[PDB]
Design an enzyme around this catalytic site. Structure first.
Site: not given
Ligand SMILES: Cc1n[nH]c(C)c1C(=O)O
Ligand SMILES: Cc1n[nH]c(C)c1C(=O)O
Length: 379
Positions: A7, A68, A172, A196
């Site tokens: 991850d 990211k 994800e 999430d």
């Protein structure tokens, strides 16, 4: 292989291995089961992970995080130009691509986002190799479901630079569903909501799963909402308390506010399993200690809007998927912030009392599913 899952998170990363039929999530050299997606450049060295995050206050202009948010994008992109305004590090343009600009060994250097992310991936690879012995060759690496092919390919480039064979880039929310075996559970179609809520991002995804095939039906959320926002609420409350009790305003003092935030972050974690947490700061301001305690009920009150607000992306992901909330067969909690009992209660009440998939540490569920997927691919 070994069978490895990564991850590669916006602020924290996690690595797991599938071995003897099960996933083991791997602690790093400080014993932490997740690792900051942080890279720091100093006068002598390049720090990654906990070492980079630990000196961030001392070196903020040369400590990179949130790569990211840049990866696979153009410098001119609206999100890049907006995000740049909140970072303490410099972002520049090379051939229309964003690069971070830092001081390193007394000189100016620029790094592509996939270069910073490769350094994070290398740290995750060495964490797995300390745990396993020998070398790691391959990995499944996860990305957000809304990532486009340039973001996916730039993530893969980070892996290639690290010297990993990237078996697959998977979503994800998909990796989270695989962690719970939802592709193998009660094999028609399952509608799966992934909720999430991380440290700095909130993603809701609706997937369908049928005969082991995943389709993203909708995505919603807030790219700038996370656990850090909850900590900000507690910091303001406790700064006011310190002012009321000790007639000292810590507001203009960077270090006092940072130390208060460190205590608040830790208090918030304890409040997920206890109804009170104690703050114990020595010499917070002008030699005055701040020892106090905060209740779970007070924490929920300070965050009433933020917690209840997480249901609006849920309603929007449903409307976009054209589903009624009664049509969701599985709800999966992902991200450290989903441990907050009030968030679990709000989500469960919204879904008419439906039980939540939550038995996997939510900050590890994505790497857990990526490791399962890796095992399948290497066979
Ligand atoms: C270490 C490492 N992994 N990936 C990159 C680009 C580096 C480095 O340059 O230090
Ligand atoms: C760990 C933990 N407990 N509670 C919370 C909110 C966390 C986290 O990681 O954010």
């Amino acid at each position: 292989g070994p069978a490895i899952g990564i991850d590669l998170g916006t602020t924290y990363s996690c690595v797991g291995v599938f071995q003897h039929g099960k996933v083991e999530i791997i602690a790093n050299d400080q014993g932490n089961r997740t690792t900051p997606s942080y890279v720091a450049f100093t006068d002598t060295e390049r720090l990654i992970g906990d070492a980079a995050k630990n000196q961030v206050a001392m070196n903020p202009t040369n400590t990179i995080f949130d790569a990211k948010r840049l990866i696979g994008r153009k410098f001119e992109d609206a999100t890049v130009q907006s995000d740049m305004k909140h970072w303490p590090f410099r972002v520049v343009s090379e051939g229309g691509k964003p690069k971070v600009q830092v001081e390193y060994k007394g000189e100016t250097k620029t790094f592509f986002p996939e270069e910073i992310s490769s350094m994070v991936l290398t740290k995750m690879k060495e964490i797995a190799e300390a745990y396993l012995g020998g070398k790691v060759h391959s990995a499944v690496i996860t990305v957000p479901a809304y990532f486009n092919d340039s973001q996916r390919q730039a993530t893969k480039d980070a892996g290639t630079i690290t010297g990993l064979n990237v078996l697959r880039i998977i979503n994800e929310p998909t990796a989270a569903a695989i962690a719970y075996g939802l592709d193998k559970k009660g094999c028609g179609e399952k509608n799966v909501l992934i909720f999430d809520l991380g440290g700095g991002t909130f993603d809701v995804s609706i997937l369908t799963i049928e005969d082991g095939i995943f389709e993203v039906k909708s995505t919603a959320g807030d790219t700038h909402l996370g656990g850090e926002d909850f900590d900000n609420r507690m910091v303001s409350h406790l700064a006011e308390e310190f002012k009321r009790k000790h007639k000292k305003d810590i507001g203009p003092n960077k270090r006092a506010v940072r130390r208060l935030r460190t205590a608040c972050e830790r208090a918030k974690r304890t409040l997920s399993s206890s109804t009170q947490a104690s703050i114990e700061i020595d010499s917070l301001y002008e030699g005055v200690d701040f020892y106090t305690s905060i209740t779970r009920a007070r924490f929920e009150e300070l965050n009433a809007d933020l917690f209840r607000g997480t249901l609006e992306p849920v309603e929007k992901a449903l409307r976009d998927a054209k589903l009624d909330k009664g049509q969701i067969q599985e709800i999966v909690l992902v991200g450290g912030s989903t441990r907050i009992p009030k968030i679990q209660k709000l989500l469960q009440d919204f879904f008419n009392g439906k039980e939540l998939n939550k038995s996997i540490n939510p900050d590890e569920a994505v790497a857990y599913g990526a490791a399962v997927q890796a095992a399948i691919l290497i066979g």
